[PDB]
Target: AGAP001425-PA
Amino acid sequence: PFPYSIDFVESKQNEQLLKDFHGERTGFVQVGEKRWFFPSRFKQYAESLYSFEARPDDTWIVTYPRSGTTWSQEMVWLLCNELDFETAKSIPLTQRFPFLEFHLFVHDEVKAEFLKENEHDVESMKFIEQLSQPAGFMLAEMKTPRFIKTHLPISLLPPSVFEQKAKIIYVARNPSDVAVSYYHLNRLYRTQGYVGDFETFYNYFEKDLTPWSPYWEHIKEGWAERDRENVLFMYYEDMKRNLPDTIRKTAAFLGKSFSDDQIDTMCTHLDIRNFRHNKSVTCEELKAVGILNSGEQGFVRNGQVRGNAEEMTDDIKRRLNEWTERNLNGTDIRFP
Ligand SMILES: COc1cc(C=O)ccc1O
Ligand SMILES: [Cl-]
Model:
């Protein structure tokens, strides 16, 4: 029984969101007292998501979007699979490490556009149809240890995750870098279909009118569970600053042990320079059927000027600082 209220965003705000986010064609919902923001299909799939059955040997990565999710998945999959770089290369990350709630973001009307554009290729059309289907079906059929990605906040996870004490890695990233990276994600994925500029996107983000917001509640729930034996909480900028420490700490939490030589191959694999050429970054299959906007691969290839993105203005930077102050005053949460 899904325990939280699911309500359509107020009419006029919902109308404006549909003008700016072309990946949704019915409307947006707010869930529970915290008003977790999702596209309309959340209402259709809330029960099946919440009743998903976790196993005690699952590995879950839980993040706010663009909080180091992909890099962490690649790291964790390799640590739990004997550093099998060969298999990591040949199977796509999205099959090795499926995204539980991706199907929420494939609207029936948008899927129909994708199918039109791929109508002469039977295998492209099967692929697009499967995107619509819950990952949970294929996850439930697996007979081996599972790797699950989600952006669902702690309070919306299947309760079976904590009942089974599945291992959870929670990664937090500072709001400035998340605002800019999430803005690019919303332009890159036609499932989101955002058409506007950064300042308009920041305005939505600051009002918790972007998927999986409220951002500060997402971070605070992660922080509130980090003492549990089955939760590892890390800040993105700590992880990136020291790969050998990150790899070892993560391995030890997962109950794996590796030589200094093995740690070094993982450090090279995950280094900024080599990771830019990783298949999990390029995402060549979503690009092949045109669900990725190929005109938005600038940010993918280049990233942002560290601590001063081209998109940032002094006014938005000031608003980020004040929003951070309001949300973190009286907590011990502090970004590196
Ligand atoms: C497959 O990666 C993502 C895609 C989207 C939107 O369709 C949102 C968050 C993600 O992590
Ligand atoms: Cl950070």
